[PDB]
A paper describes a structure:
l-asparaginase II (EC 3.5.1.1) is an amidohydrolase that primarily catalyzes the hydrolysis of l-Asn to l-Asp and ammonia, but that can also act on other substrates, including l-Gln. To understand the structural implications of the four-amino acid differences between [name]-[name] and [name]-4M, we solved their crystal structure in the presence of l-Asp under the same crystallization condition and data collection method.
This [name]-4M sequence corresponds to asparaginase from other strains, including BL21­(DE3) (GenBank: CAQ33267; ACN38272.1). The [name] from BL21­(DE3), hereby cited as [name]-4M, is the prevalent form used in commercial pharmaceutical preparations of l-asparaginase, including Elspar (the innovator product, approved by the FDA in 1978), Spectrila, and their PEGylated versions, respectively Oncaspar and Asparlas. All monomers in the asymmetric unit showed the l-Asp in the active site. The monomers of [name]-[name] and [name]-4M were essentially superposable, with Cα RMSD values lower than 0.4 Å. The specific activity of [name]-[name] and [name]-4 M was assessed by monitoring the hydrolysis of the l-Asn in vitro. However, the results show that the [name]-4 M variant exhibits a substrate turnover rate (k cat) approximately twice that of [name]-[name], which can explain the differences in specific activity and cytotoxicity. The analysis of the binding curves obtained from this experiment allowed for the calculation of the dissociation constant (K D) of the enzymes for l-Asp. This analysis demonstrated that the [name]-[name] variant has a dissociation constant for the product of the catalyzed reaction that is three times higher than that of the [name]-4M variant, with K D values of 211 ± 52 and 66 ± 14 μM, respectively. In contrast, the [name]-4M variant shows lower specificity for l-Asn, with a k cat Asn/k cat Gln ratio of 18.2 ± 0.2.
Author numbering:
A (entry chain B), B (entry chain B), C (entry chain A), D (entry chain A): 1 to 326
Amino acid sequence: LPNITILATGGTIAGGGDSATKSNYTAGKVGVENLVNAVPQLKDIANVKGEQVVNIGSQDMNDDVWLTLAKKINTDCDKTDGFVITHGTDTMEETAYFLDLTVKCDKPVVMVGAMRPSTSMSADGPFNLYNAVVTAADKASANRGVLVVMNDTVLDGRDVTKTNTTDVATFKSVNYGPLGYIHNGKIDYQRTPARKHTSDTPFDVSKLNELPKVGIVYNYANASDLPAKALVDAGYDGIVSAGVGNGNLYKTVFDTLATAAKNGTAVVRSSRVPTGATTQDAEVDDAKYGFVASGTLNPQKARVLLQLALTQTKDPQQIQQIFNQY
Amino acid sequence: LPNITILATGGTIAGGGDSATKSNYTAGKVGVENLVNAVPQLKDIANVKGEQVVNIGSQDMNDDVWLTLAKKINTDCDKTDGFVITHGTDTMEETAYFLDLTVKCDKPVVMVGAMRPSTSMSADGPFNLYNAVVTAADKASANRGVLVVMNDTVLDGRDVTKTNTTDVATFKSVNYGPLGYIHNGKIDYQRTPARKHTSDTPFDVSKLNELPKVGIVYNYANASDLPAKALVDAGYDGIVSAGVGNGNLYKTVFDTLATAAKNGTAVVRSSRVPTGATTQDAEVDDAKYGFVASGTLNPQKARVLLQLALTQTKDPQQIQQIFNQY
Amino acid sequence: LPNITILATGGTIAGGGDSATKSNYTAGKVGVENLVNAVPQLKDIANVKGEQVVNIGSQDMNDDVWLTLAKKINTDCDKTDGFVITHGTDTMEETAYFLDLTVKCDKPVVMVGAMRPSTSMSADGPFNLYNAVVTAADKASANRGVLVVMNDTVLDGRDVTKTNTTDVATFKSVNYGPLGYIHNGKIDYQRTPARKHTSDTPFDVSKLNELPKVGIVYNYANASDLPAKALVDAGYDGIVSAGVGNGNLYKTVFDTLATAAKNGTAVVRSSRVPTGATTQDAEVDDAKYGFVASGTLNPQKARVLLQLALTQTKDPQQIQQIFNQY
Amino acid sequence: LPNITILATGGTIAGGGDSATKSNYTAGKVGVENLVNAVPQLKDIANVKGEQVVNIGSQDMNDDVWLTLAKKINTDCDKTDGFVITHGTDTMEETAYFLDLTVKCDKPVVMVGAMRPSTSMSADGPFNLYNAVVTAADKASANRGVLVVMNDTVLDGRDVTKTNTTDVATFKSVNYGPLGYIHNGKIDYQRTPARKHTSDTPFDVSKLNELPKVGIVYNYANASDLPAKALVDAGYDGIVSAGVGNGNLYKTVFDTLATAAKNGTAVVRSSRVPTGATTQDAEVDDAKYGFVASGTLNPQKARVLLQLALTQTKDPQQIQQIFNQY
Ligand SMILES: N[C@@H](CC(=O)O)C(=O)O
Ligand SMILES: N[C@@H](CC(=O)O)C(=O)O
Ligand SMILES: N[C@@H](CC(=O)O)C(=O)O
Ligand SMILES: N[C@@H](CC(=O)O)C(=O)O
């Protein structure tokens, strides 16, 4: 049977809450061995090893956990046939993309979480973790980058995003769609990501103890320049704009960032809008102000790639090329 | 024929850009008479009156325009059989909700914009404005609150949100769905909003020259408390959290706002997640910290209702009741 | 606590496999009392009683079970505070709509099923049933017609359809959306159906032992007229076209359905297309030929209405009327 | 500039009404040269030439046009840099897939249609055709099989289907998603189909004047076995079940299709359900009875594959093989 490492970093997948019929619970309170023995059917398909990395709620997720994650995956590559990370759903789309860029293992890394806590009636997490292990054990799952397996679906880490607050089917690759579906412990893969991933990137976090500070401002009607101004005062290496429509800013947030761009801050335009590209050659001359268009990458996902781009260069056009490649 | 007032505040619906096959253009550069005479078929269904309110891009939209808007609609109620506001698509979901709460006209107010500029090949705006006028002229459209009519669909202002950056079909009511569809200049309405709207609210902007400052922070991995802290320094009456999953915050953004709640700032939890409620009785004890759960209202939409709630009260539980009613 | 009767018909909610990990199962081999006792949390929210009506896979559902279900609900109406129907998912949309039109009872009738068998890991049916009892218990569910509760979502019988073959979230209201969502045993209803339903209809099945024969024919490239033909020859009372696009016919089906319609068969043009209305005033002169446009009714839903419409009149214009009203 | 041939078949792209405001029209009454000349921006991006193949409404599309189209494309393959097929929207999914399997040509074949007639206000077809010439001109479109370009979106012939009766955005890839999006004449391709296509298939239509007869039968509550029966009796070569749920049959259709399948008719179980696979290993012993599971192929797509599969073998296991591969 395939040697699958489970890496455990928390999430509702490992959270409980008194009544099976109450929505009240705590993230990251259950250990990796409980999870594993809660799904005895893993024994039949994998030689699972549990390792607890942290035990937090992914709302609390951070760079440290990311760096600890890439490292341990990269370091433990050749002692196992695939990895599975149990993770909170709230920021799984970020970690998954982070790992997607920083992991150099060709072998299946798969993230998985659960929208209902383990004490819930009809809890999602057992079958989630089952199918995630299945995915991790499929030969075909190799060389497709970091995966999220949720609700019977294999999603790529680049596009996977959380579309609903509570639905078990919340995870969806909302622009290019999923890679394959899971029936009966078998996957028919029909799609594979075309953007460069895992081993095909230059990113290398091996020797890194922290990441270039990057923050996110939201644009709305009458948007305040105060969030933006704050981040530059504090010397942020990067601001990602959560812009309106095709990545537009408010007048004040525009000027602040237009300045910031001329004074060394990288600025990437993305969109609060849930699907679709932030394009160049629309209403904002990106070359003129030195901005970068985030493409299909929503804000938080743009934040991930900004940080890792920043650890190569500070130049608007080198970054844009990285948004067009990765 | 029905006396329909068009109110013009800008948008791509009134923007152009050299080549019909280039995506480069300027918002708010075309006047209301050009728009009207660009769609001669309005003459057959309405007695249209054009009035230019401003001529901006809705990325630049603000409170002044909102207040000018409600007022003129409320004031001109009884000189016309319905209104239509031409608006940029970027923040139409906000204005539409604003108007939804502040307008006291039972008569059809309908917003409309276009995702392709008027010089574009196969431009959306003609037919958009046609069908919006149709909507404004339908008796059935009365008493359903402020409407967005886009891509052959009548959407309520509360739920209407912009789901795509570029698609002409971007506007969708992503939790409770549309109210009716438009075929052949006729609408079959099947749905009407159940939340209190227009005349059934207490909001009254008649005598108001400004609105309680409210801002939006975004939560992500390793979120900075700097945006939040900034807004409280400056004495904001309200912060809306763009939280992860079911409205969760990062540890730092949590504490800052937990403080802010104890020191007079209203704090409303919403979600960056595009569909679904921010619920109470989930992972965050709202009563304990004095927070308010934004419900199906995304951040920007929560911002609208926070501002207008703030002009009644500063108390967490009176506000929550307004999020549950409106 | 309310009194809630469960009319169990079968399906996968009541199906079984030899495995929680394999997908191979048999529908409706489990009694009603088993379903009730595997969800003892029902006790906190209602006084439940389960009666077995049939125990079939809903792929085999037929006119007799519907006549049984309906009158049984109308008859036993004031012995209970609410009804929950366990039912297979395959034809549930069809039953829901049928009870939607035939149920003269003024109490919540809620349909529920499962996509995973009860033996299956993370089986959806314990919590489905719970949520369906909640919906059927909530006083606010009255006056919304026959209802379907799947994946934390309350759906109207008219729009509800199965959008996916395997996914737990298959059931959606693809045109007008859901009536309400369910969190922590509570429903935030924001919507009600506008087409008249339940007691508002003239359809009285209480003396019928038998429904007009209505069959359905698929259109597609190079369509055979053999099925149309074979239904006319058995003197079916009505035929529904699952047409292409907006109710369009393949030329030999058009000939057969047109002749048949002059000779007294009713024929409805519906569409194989999964969302959107089959409208009038496109490419087919419905009035010329005696055809009825289905509207948003898909073929099998439109068969439900058409059957019930044939019990009132055999007149094309009058069936249009019903098709515009119910 | 590339050389792009346009094989025009008709549809609404080439349809006309008496009005830009009314919805009443006739499909395919406009010549190819008209289409080309109403979009003179084609000049900047290609050397276009339009040949008229037929001028039908695609609701009337049939096996002969497909045989014509296919060989004409294979024959005229190296006279051009690319092909664009104008075509009605109703059966376009069916043609696309057919050319997907039959086109041995190694150049972009792109299908395009319109949902609004050319006379209509904000008609979608000028820009559709433009975008289809872009797609057919882009060198990056090679090696992705026969393609469909609608609403700024490049879709693979296999997954693409018409999800809505009237909306300009009807065409989606409902299972695996789009191949690429189109902005400002440019395509960000992030995906390619994995099922083998075009030259990768053993289907050679180049000497066929005639395709195996394959019909389609709908399942629904109380289904008539009359259509199945009537197709067996005309010695159809194959039958597709538009089943309920995951390929399920109504009992009398099951009997008829099972007997027919032992007697040499091939029968595929597809599904009326608009998304998701008709899988094996659920409720039907496909192997026992000689049935083939369609997978993600919907009935009409599955008829395309089944027809072409009948030209290779009459053997159930071997048609499964094709159904797992193409
Ligand atoms: N707050 C949780 C949500 C979940 O896991 O369901 C998290 O850690 O993301
Ligand atoms: N930036 C534009 C976008 C549009 O109208 O299409 C606006 O004013 O919202
Ligand atoms: N064949 C089953 C499917 C299910 O219930 O999940 C039925 O319709 O009974
Ligand atoms: N009946 C038309 C529909 C369209 O093209 O929009 C066709 O399929 O030809």
